[PDB]
């Protein structure tokens with residue numbers, strides 16, 4: 076997260092870290108057994124880490140649970156990043172408490188102009204690299220579809236939306252991939268792509284979760 080703020084320990088209790096010997100992506104806990112992340116975060120041997128603040132120090136509230144299965148969206152296209160969504164099933168149910176909690180799926184899509192909360196342990200610089208210890212947060216508005224399409228001509232599908240600041244300076248970034256965009260208490264987006272981070276006229280592009288609720292529900296009802 077570039078140009079954000081320190082969230083505060085466990086204030087984003089649905090935020091997870093995906094670990095494969097190191098943190099590599101975020102995700103969102105949607106019930107005791109399932110995490111939503113980006114399909115571009117797919118790899119074998121994922122351990123889901125819940126209740127994290129400092130990802131490099133065991134602070135006492137963590138639950139580390141191995142993934143039993145990963146299900147990439149059937150229409151995910153890694154070239155265009157269309158349908159950039161994946162479900163990860165935990166080997167055992169997380170124990171839900173104040174510091175580890177699920178986030179609601181949307182019943183309707185979010186509105187342009189709505190301020191959303193984006194979070195992660197990704198790069199905090201727009202040029203150069205610096206990775207934070209503790210979870211970072213950014214409040215960012217959903218942009219109009221026409222401004223989103225103008226920013227990325229020929230690349231924005233109906234399964235994507237833009238959020239952020241056209242002036243630059245505030246954005247998600249590498250390492251935030253797969254993490255939450257929560258608007259009005261609903262998981263509305265997944266950190267997906269963008270040209271660099273926090274670049275002028277290049278806002279963040281996010282998987283449009285409201286389009287996938289049917290697939291999510293049917294998948295978790297059968298796996």
Ligand SMILES: N=C(N)c1ccc(/C=N/OCC(=O)O)cc1
Pocket residue numbers: 099246247248249250251252266267268269270271272273278279280
């Ligand atoms: N909002 C952005 N500008 C943005 C967000 C996410 C990415 C994804 N990078 O994938 C590589 C990785 O995370 O390791 C790029 C740009």
Ligand SMILES: [Ca+2]
Pocket residue numbers: 127128129130131132133134137
């Ligand atoms: Ca920790």
